[PDB]
Amino acid sequence: QQMGRGSMCDAFVGTWKLVSSENFDDYMKEVGVGFATRKVAGMAKPNMIISVNGDVITIKSESTFKNTEISFILGQEFDEVTADDRKVKSTITLDGGVLVHVQKWDGKSTTIKRKREDDKLVVECVMKGVTSTRVYERA
């Protein structure tokens, strides 16, 4: 083994904690999440751990609602069971520095964008015309 070099995506790596959220209930309604799941999911303040190992990126969410972990290679579709229990087909790419995560299920699509802004990691969730913005800080 030699030590690999870094990458772009190193700006995302770390341990992050949710500090604010706007319009997440409306985003979840647009997605189709039911009432009791929305209420409990909307209270959560997860910790998100992002790591890279070679070509494989892992995003772990540790949450009082539902722990999740996804591992992927940019550009390469994978199966994902979301925190709210959708079975989706996901592809995550980089668009100029923004991680773009598209989920497809039941003929529907939603996109979750993740971007560094100052010391924060801003997450924009989009379903049709409804956007939610979630802001994470370093833990």
Side-chain angles (χ1 to χ4, degrees), residues 71-120:
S71 296
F72 58 92
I73 299 173
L74 296 168
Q76 304 196 357
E77 182 182 61
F78 60 98
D79 293 308
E80 176 178 15
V81 180
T82 68
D84 64 297
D85 205 32
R86 293 168 288 127
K87 287 65 150 136
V88 307
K89 295 289 187 190
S90 290
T91 309
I92 300 176
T93 57
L94 281 166
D95 176 18
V98 177
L99 280 168
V100 179
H101 181 178
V102 183
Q103 298 178 153
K104 304 296 195 182
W105 78 106
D106 198 30
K108 298 165 182 169
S109 185
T110 190
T111 299
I112 302 171
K113 293 187 185 184
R114 301 178 176 96
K115 193 184 171 85
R116 284 287 313 278
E117 297 285 353
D118 302 318
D119 290 323
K120 301 170 181 169

Side-chain angles (χ1 to χ4, degrees), residues 21-100:
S21 181
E22 284 286 357
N23 213 48
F24 190 60
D25 186 67
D26 285 347
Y27 170 77
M28 290 190 286
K29 283 188 173 174
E30 203 70 7
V31 166
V33 183
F35 176 88
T37 301
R38 296 198 313 280
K39 295 304 160 188
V40 170
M43 293 295 303
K45 294 288 201 300
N47 268 39
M48 176 172 54
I49 305 171
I50 303 178
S51 62
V52 180
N53 184 147
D55 296 336
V56 182
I57 303 165
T58 303
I59 305 176
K60 183 174 185 197
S61 181
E62 301 181 307
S63 171
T64 46
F65 169 55
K66 179 69 173 160
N67 292 323
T68 62
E69 182 185 322
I70 59 168
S71 296
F72 58 92
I73 299 173
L74 296 168
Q76 304 196 357
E77 182 182 61
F78 60 98
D79 293 308
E80 176 178 15
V81 180
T82 68
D84 64 297
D85 205 32
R86 293 168 288 127
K87 287 65 150 136
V88 307
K89 295 289 187 190
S90 290
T91 309
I92 300 176
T93 57
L94 281 166
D95 176 18
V98 177
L99 280 168
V100 179

